[PDB]
Amino acid sequence: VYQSVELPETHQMLRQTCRDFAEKELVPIAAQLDKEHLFPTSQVKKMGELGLLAMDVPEELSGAGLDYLAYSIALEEISRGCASTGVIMSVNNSLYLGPILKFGSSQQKQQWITPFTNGDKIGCFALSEPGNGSDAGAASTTAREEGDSWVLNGTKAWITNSWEASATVVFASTDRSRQNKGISAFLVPMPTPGLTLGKKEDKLGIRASSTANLIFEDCRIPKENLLGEPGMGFKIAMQTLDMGRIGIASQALGIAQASLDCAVKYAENRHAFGAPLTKLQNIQFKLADMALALESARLLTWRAAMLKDNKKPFTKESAMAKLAASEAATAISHQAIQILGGMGYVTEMPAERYYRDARITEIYEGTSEIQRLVIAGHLLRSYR
Amino acid sequence: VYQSVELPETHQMLRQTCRDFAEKELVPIAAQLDKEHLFPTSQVKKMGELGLLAMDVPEELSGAGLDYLAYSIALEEISRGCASTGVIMSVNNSLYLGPILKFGSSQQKQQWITPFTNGDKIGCFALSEPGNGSDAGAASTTAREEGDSWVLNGTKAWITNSWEASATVVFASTDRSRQNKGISAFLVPMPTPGLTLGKKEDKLGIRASSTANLIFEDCRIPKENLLGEPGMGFKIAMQTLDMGRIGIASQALGIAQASLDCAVKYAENRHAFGAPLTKLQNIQFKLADMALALESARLLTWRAAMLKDNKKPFTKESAMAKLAASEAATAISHQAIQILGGMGYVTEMPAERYYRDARITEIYEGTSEIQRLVIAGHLLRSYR
Amino acid sequence: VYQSVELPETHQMLRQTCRDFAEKELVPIAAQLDKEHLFPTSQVKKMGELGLLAMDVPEELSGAGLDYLAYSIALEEISRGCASTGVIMSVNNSLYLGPILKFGSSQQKQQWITPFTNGDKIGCFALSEPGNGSDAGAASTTAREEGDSWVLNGTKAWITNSWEASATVVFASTDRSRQNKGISAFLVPMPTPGLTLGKKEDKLGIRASSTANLIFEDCRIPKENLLGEPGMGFKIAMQTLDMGRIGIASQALGIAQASLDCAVKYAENRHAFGAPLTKLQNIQFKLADMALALESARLLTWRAAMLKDNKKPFTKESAMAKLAASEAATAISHQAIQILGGMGYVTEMPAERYYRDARITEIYEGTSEIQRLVIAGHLLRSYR
Amino acid sequence: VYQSVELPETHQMLRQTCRDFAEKELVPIAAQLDKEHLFPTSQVKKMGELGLLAMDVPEELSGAGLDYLAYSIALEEISRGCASTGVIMSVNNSLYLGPILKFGSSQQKQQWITPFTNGDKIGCFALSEPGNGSDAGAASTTAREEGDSWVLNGTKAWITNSWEASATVVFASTDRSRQNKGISAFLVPMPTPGLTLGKKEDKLGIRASSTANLIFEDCRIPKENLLGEPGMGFKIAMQTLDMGRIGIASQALGIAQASLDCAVKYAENRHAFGAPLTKLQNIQFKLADMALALESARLLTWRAAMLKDNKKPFTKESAMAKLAASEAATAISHQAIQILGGMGYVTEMPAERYYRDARITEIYEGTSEIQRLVIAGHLLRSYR
Ligand SMILES: CC(=O)CC(=O)SCCNC(=O)CCNC(=O)[C@H](O)C(C)(C)COP(=O)(O)OP(=O)(O)OC[C@H]1O[C@@H](n2cnc3c(N)ncnc32)[C@H](O)[C@@H]1OP(=O)(O)O
Ligand SMILES: CC(=O)CC(=O)SCCNC(=O)CCNC(=O)[C@H](O)C(C)(C)COP(=O)(O)OP(=O)(O)OC[C@H]1O[C@@H](n2cnc3c(N)ncnc32)[C@H](O)[C@@H]1OP(=O)(O)O
Ligand SMILES: CC(=O)CC(=O)SCCNC(=O)CCNC(=O)[C@H](O)C(C)(C)COP(=O)(O)OP(=O)(O)OC[C@H]1O[C@@H](n2cnc3c(N)ncnc32)[C@H](O)[C@@H]1OP(=O)(O)O
Ligand SMILES: CC(=O)CC(=O)SCCNC(=O)CCNC(=O)[C@H](O)C(C)(C)COP(=O)(O)OP(=O)(O)OC[C@H]1O[C@@H](n2cnc3c(N)ncnc32)[C@H](O)[C@@H]1OP(=O)(O)O
Ligand SMILES: Cc1cc2nc3c(=O)[nH]c(=O)nc-3n(C[C@H](O)[C@H](O)[C@H](O)COP(=O)(O)OP(=O)(O)OC[C@H]3O[C@@H](n4cnc5c(N)ncnc54)[C@H](O)[C@@H]3O)c2cc1C
Ligand SMILES: Cc1cc2nc3c(=O)[nH]c(=O)nc-3n(C[C@H](O)[C@H](O)[C@H](O)COP(=O)(O)OP(=O)(O)OC[C@H]3O[C@@H](n4cnc5c(N)ncnc54)[C@H](O)[C@@H]3O)c2cc1C
Ligand SMILES: Cc1cc2nc3c(=O)[nH]c(=O)nc-3n(C[C@H](O)[C@H](O)[C@H](O)COP(=O)(O)OP(=O)(O)OC[C@H]3O[C@@H](n4cnc5c(N)ncnc54)[C@H](O)[C@@H]3O)c2cc1C
Ligand SMILES: Cc1cc2nc3c(=O)[nH]c(=O)nc-3n(C[C@H](O)[C@H](O)[C@H](O)COP(=O)(O)OP(=O)(O)OC[C@H]3O[C@@H](n4cnc5c(N)ncnc54)[C@H](O)[C@@H]3O)c2cc1C
């Protein structure tokens, strides 16, 4: 329901295919997945076969050989069907495969990427800890080197996919005297001796995805599991987040789109005072504001995705898309419930689920406050 | 807390009683009530014993003999402890006893008010129907006079307290062609022949309260169950809602206060980048805005209550309070989640429930759009 | 201070050239133009020589032979230097030349377009009247046919460029029984017998441009001055406004950009509490919100400009850009004054002028309320 | 109008007096005052005669003997007629007489208060300097005790009433190394040797009032001109501003009320699409929001006034009022222009002036950001 300039036929086809999939495989089960906190095993597998779980990964590594513009469009359509399935997909793409593909060695790419491109295995990203999330550099989890292996100790918090993943990219302190400059990234298989999973979190939204802590107690891994060079941890997490934030913005657009779709359809069929709700000036103004917010957020998101594809700096653009999209999702999903009235408050309709799923997009992968700090830093830098 | 002008000792003292009650009886069980959708039977009875279920009712009729200012203050403290308990209380006070006290005959007051003041029995308000909520005058439920009896037929929708009430005030048309001028109000005992309850509605918030349809199939009630004059029903519904809206304004103030308390307490303990969150300027600004919106909405609410007590017009003032408070509750509870970050998205903290409960205040007893219409109508009337 | 994907070198050069012009010719005199309500005669002429006054017009007609994407970029840079000069340019491009180029005959193009492409002569657009502006179809000005000429009678209101134009495209009723379907467009030379100019309006902003009524008293024009077919008036005004709204959105981006520029520069030099204002978290968040709003508005504007170039429908996109850009201009210019503090309230700085100039973008060429109606109409149509 | 709880006859009566005064003496000349930057000499004297320039001053000292509630009410009515006249009045009341009445010796009260209560003479408040406004404790102006005299040196900036005042309360440091603990307050007569006025500042709004720098070059004043104890100056400045902010809150309420009155009156007369603007739902919604924000801010203002009168702490409550009212004045005056459409952008109507005057209320006597800081500080103090 939005018009774009001249999108490549490859991307237009991709959009149609994902919309059909979401409409056929996700829409009818989204409610039950949310209610039962059930991981969409079968759906994720089918997605992998379509190559949706490794969109940016080249053909050589068994990837889809597409780009981030394609990734954003596909993620929106999927998230429109089920926000949980959308993040599960975003995590494997941007957060797991993303950093390995960019910083890993030929060998690491072959053993940690290839096995996670078809849906049989998915990864996760472990940066946050109980004592710190926004304050990323304050990593307390440590990694000691013991000759031909590293020994990890500490607790990681809020790990998405933790209960279904077969590997994780964890960030630990290897040199405390350098603080945020003494952090390193490590590839850890799951399960593995010394690694324990915390209890699943009971959350407001995206309840189909798992969220738990990762407890490391003298967990040993080979020395070669180090990703990049020692002390490169913070930079890797940051550049990885620049990519991931484009993914979360895309998930947000999908939730917002589903909300607008539901609101419009309901308003045209629901009568009040002898006519459809769409005859009320107020309802029109709302739908106008909702559409504007969404289409603006999509353009920002697409700009960021394209800058990444063209190999241009995109940290600020990524933060702007994530911020605008997430805030638009909550506002738009909020108005959808409003337009539905009483029907918007009950589980019979999906409006309340959209409201609950949207709320997380304003928090993870960097809260809105942090995105604003990031934007100001780059904005001022361009003025200096 | 907030600083008030100079409340009478009775009201200042009442505030303390209700806050201690909420703190001891509601706060510790609020999470369980929400999770189990459990009606707080023991607590409602206690509140009944305290005289909180019939505050504006004179002592002669077994009421507490207070006023709406006290009602507002008491309802805020209760709702801060549990939003469901608060609406259960507001319904009995404003929607059930209110209309009977104002338009009931001496005999109706003895029969229908007295047995509902101690917490053994409570009532409900049945105006809305599946096909109309905002458009209150389009009721399809009918009532025909069969000599010594009225016979009711139709379906009322969204009735709060429906599964626990012993009486209801229903609004039915006696001549559907006369539209909103053919509506009359009736008192119906529950249970009773010809009246069945719909299944409980599964909702986003205030889940400890029941919500369901009331189905009338040739339900016969004595001729004297007519409340007021025939065709006076719409007016009775409208004036009753003017009182009820001050009640919902008070409930919203409670959810908003509970939210602020949670945000402040957490903000002073949680550390980020070396210091408490309260040291961050942005955090300080959010708290300031949260405080302003809440104290501001409380003054509007108290104003409406006092006008009501002084027997002055208060329709516009009542709509302003309900509107400002309901929107503040959602904005403040939204920000409380943000300030807690990840912890605000999980059930371990109460913030997510506040967000859910707050959402309904912008919808029932007249949506925000309806409030705005009512406000605009009276405003214009003041200039002409 | 914004990053775009891959802009054609032709447009990048065009941007640089206009920025230099604005910086050299407009920035240093903008204040005096605003204070004295002085039309920038010399500047407009230089602009014409650069071909800025006929950007969309093909080379054959003595135009610049560019497109609307080029037009938007050039208009932003110019408006950043002086909002008045920007609208004077927008009017000649989109409102005067625009409709003649699209609906005029080969002959009309030669005598009404060619002489208005170099800066010696500029046109104006007369649709609004004292009794109606938003309600466009309610044209009261009439045109009677007298064989080989038309006779115009009535008053046109708020005509920009009226005191400096040499021609105007006026809309008059030729058939009152068909109302908004009985309006026709006419080309009228200025001066001409029967046409009188009203007194110049004293306005809040864009004071360098002239605004006055056009009084027609038995004003006769040749029959061939009719533009398009009889009754085609409304459609021509509407399609013309779709183009013009892209121009006003562009002017808005320029005012917003100048506001952001001023705010950033001032905040980095002004100290408070021992450090630049840019060290205060609050100021950072503001600048972040201002940049986001502006870059979002620019993308919307560019999308609309490009759809017009590609010959695709753009009415909704045009309305969205105009709305978002104008509202962003007022918010951003408002925060610029705020960040400057006392300095933002005095004429020594340009911040207050930006605030005053921005306010008009929310009104002319369709108020924000009307843009919202337009958007909803198309949004719903796409859902039908 | 608005419905109040139950004002004492004195205040209800005072409201009428001030409204009739504003209606007859200010409204008809407000446009000329703004346009000519003319200080309303005749009117200030009249207000002096009515006792409006020294409302909180006891009768023994020639004051009207009222309170801050009356002051607030009277100031709103005056500001509705002319925003400049209102600030001239607020300065004399809160910023000049306020500090002298609270910290002055018996003799200082007779010498500096009495001659300034009838409108023949008025005072000003000199705290800010070119290098600091928000950072009040960074004053560079110095005062050294030369035995029987103090000698002042420095520049105070932005002084309201500077060109018409006969006395000023200046804040100067006695030891710049002690920062905000080395500030003292002094009473300085005007004119006087060593004191020159800077040129009048040309500003966006409240143009009938004067604003200029005060330049001290070895200005000698008697030893007894010290207000309070040495080093007590910062505290005196802060407590004085707590009173002054209730004043600015009242002025903003006046500009906002004048704006609403203009919007309603115009909305009922202007026709569009067949009926009055008031028939359009969107117009009704704006008026409703405008009314809510204004009555809401008035209650906050009255609360602060009453606390002040009851000798209770009111710093936080005073900041909330000034903040909410100032922001409401800009939002409401902005919407008034929108509702008038084209007519709101020209000087023929007063809406554009309201917009201009409203803008300053968010800046002086402490910017909105400062108010928020003060609010957050006291809020947190209530929880600890
Ligand atoms: C599925 C999910 O739900 C996933 C999860 O959410 S993932 C976890 C999400 N967590 C976050 O996003 C955390 C938010 N925090 C951040 O992004 C950052 O910690 C921050 C913006 C607050 C900055 O942190 P900081 O400690 O102040 O570091 P700062 O001083 O800005 O930067 C330190 C270094 O990193 C570099 N850096 C920062 N961002 C960078 C980027 N995008 N690319 C490369 N380098 C970068 C800096 O340039 C600097 O390098 P030098 O000074 O050595 O040149
Ligand atoms: C626990 C819970 O959650 C409880 C539930 O929510 S309860 C159900 C809540 N539903 C609502 O609040 C519905 C919202 N709707 C309304 O308030 C109204 O339907 C409305 C404002 C939209 C107006 O409806 P309308 O059909 O246009 O009627 P309108 O023309 O305004 O009024 C009709 C008559 O009623 C009168 N009236 C309206 N409001 C009145 C009031 N507050 N007091 C007295 N009379 C009133 C009018 O003066 C008019 O009188 P006449 O024509 O006889 O002279
Ligand atoms: C420099 C300056 O400052 C310039 C000035 O501002 S210029 C003056 C600016 N004035 C405006 O922008 C006025 C705002 N008003 C409008 O745009 C319109 O009057 C409106 C949106 C309110 C709609 O008006 P309306 O009377 O309700 O007409 P509506 O029923 O929507 O449309 C009537 C016909 O015009 C057609 N139409 C509308 N927009 C159209 C467009 N963009 N292209 C083609 N046809 C269009 C409709 O399809 C319809 O045709 P049919 O029914 O015959 O198929
Ligand atoms: C007509 C007009 O237009 C008039 C003009 O505007 S008048 C000029 C307006 N300027 C302002 O309003 C300036 C805004 N700034 C302020 O209010 C303050 O400078 C501020 C809130 C930013 C705080 O400043 P600060 O330097 O950080 O001082 P802070 O640490 O808060 O306070 C220092 C001392 O003053 C005291 N103080 C602060 N506010 C106080 C109050 N309202 N009452 C009493 N004491 C107060 C503190 O308790 C503290 O005491 P000790 O340290 O001695 O125990
Ligand atoms: C459902 C869910 C899934 C998650 N999945 C993952 C995952 O897969 N992997 C992973 O690594 N992490 C994950 N997280 C963690 C997430 O990244 C953090 O929750 C988030 O970054 C915020 O950190 P926090 O919870 O510690 O909040 P805090 O950092 O404690 O922040 C609290 C508040 O203070 C504000 N704040 C903090 N610092 C500043 C500052 N400098 N300036 C201004 N304001 C500031 C924040 O904006 C927030 O409003 C997940 C969280 C959730 C809820
Ligand atoms: C938990 C819950 C409990 C409830 N309890 C009760 C109860 O005890 N008793 C009872 O009688 N009812 C009850 N209700 C019903 C409630 O009053 C209605 O849900 C509410 O009034 C809205 O009506 P609706 O749901 O039919 O929405 P609709 O009336 O269909 O409205 C949908 C949307 O259109 C808008 N709209 C409608 N008309 C207009 C208009 N003229 N102008 C502008 N916008 C308009 C609405 O504002 C809303 O945004 C309850 C509802 C809920 C969710
Ligand atoms: C500086 C300036 C320059 C101008 N230059 C030109 C020019 O060159 N050429 C030209 O032809 N015109 C010009 N105009 C006129 C301009 O297009 C109109 O002023 C504008 O369209 C609004 O019309 P109006 O002033 O009659 O306001 P009105 O139409 O009276 O509107 C008043 C209010 O009601 C609202 N409203 C109206 N209809 C509706 C509706 N259906 N639904 C909801 N809300 C509605 C409006 O949004 C507005 O808020 C200019 C105006 C100004 C101020
Ligand atoms: C018409 C007019 C009349 C005036 N009359 C008087 C008068 O009679 N007497 C008098 O003494 N003064 C007077 N002033 C001055 C007034 O008090 C200051 O303009 C105001 O306090 C802001 O100070 P500033 O202009 O130096 O701005 P700055 O202090 O430089 O501030 C600029 C921006 O930075 C922000 N900022 C600064 N510090 C902080 C912080 N800690 N946290 C967050 N944000 C911050 C401000 O909020 C503002 O947005 C007047 C000003 C005007 C415009």
CATH superfamily of the largest domain in chain A: Butyryl-CoA Dehydrogenase, subunit A, domain 3
**What is the number of E strands of chain A?**
8
> End-to-end span of chain A in angstroms?
41 Å
Please name the CATH architecture of the largest domain in chain A: Up-down Bundle
Strands of the largest sheet of chain A, in order across it?
Answer: 1-4-5-8
Order of helical and strand elements of chain A? HHHHHHEEEEEEEEHHHHH
Beta strand % of chain A: 5-15%
The most extensive interface between chains reads: A-C, 45 and 45 residues
- Total of helices of chain A: 11
Ligand names: acetoacetyl-coenzyme A, flavin-adenine dinucleotide
User: What's the CATH class of the largest domain in chain A, please?
Assistant: Mainly Alpha
Largest sheet of chain A: 4 strands, mixed
What is the radius of gyration of chain A computed over CA atoms, rounded to a whole number of angstroms? 21 Å
Broad shape of chain A: globular
CATH topology of the largest domain in chain A: Butyryl-CoA Dehydrogenase, subunit A, domain 3
**Number of individual domains of chain A:** 3
Oligomeric organization of the protein chains: homotetramer
PDB class: oxidoreductase
Keywords: flavoprotein, enzyme-inhibitor complex, oxidoreductase
Assembly: tetrameric
Entry title: Crystal Structure of Rat Short Chain Acyl-CoA Dehydrogenase Complexed With Acetoacetyl-CoA
